[PDB]
Amino acid sequence: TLECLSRSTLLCVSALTVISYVTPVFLVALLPLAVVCYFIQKYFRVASRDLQQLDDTTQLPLLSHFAETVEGLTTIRAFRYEARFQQKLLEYTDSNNIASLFLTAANRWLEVRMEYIGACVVLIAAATSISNSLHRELSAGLVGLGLT
């Protein structure tokens, strides 16, 4: 995980530096959007952590419950308490699913919004490259790196 984090952060910094060097103007347009990401960061973590731990909790009494039914199976089939225990297990699996569902919903949220911004940046980069690097800049080798 440390290796992956290092590779990711350095690749991102390198890509930003590339799209900056390719177009001087595009750089000044990308710093606003990136600041946007800062606001998208905080609001994410302070929830993504939270939901995470909640998942763990709804996983712990569920499994344990299963085990309790297996050992004292004769007592539970004798008391005829099968209905109430099935109700309890439906309750527990619902409490597990709501957590494991909100977590994937939040991950999708962060994904889609970060992607929308990652598409805004390539739109602006290409729009600046087609004019600056062709009309006045008259450079072909630049727009390639920036777009890619």
């Binding site: 609001y43 939270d50 699996t93 619902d94 409490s95 709501i98 909100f102």
Partner: peptide
């Protein structure tokens, strides 16, 4: 997510699954 930033989430602050997806 905005409400979650301020107040800590819990099962009382969380919803309940729709009829479309239950046990």
């Amino acid at each position: 997510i905005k409400t979650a930033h301020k107040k800590p989430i819990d099962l009382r602050a969380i919803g309940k699954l729709p009829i479309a997806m239950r046990a």
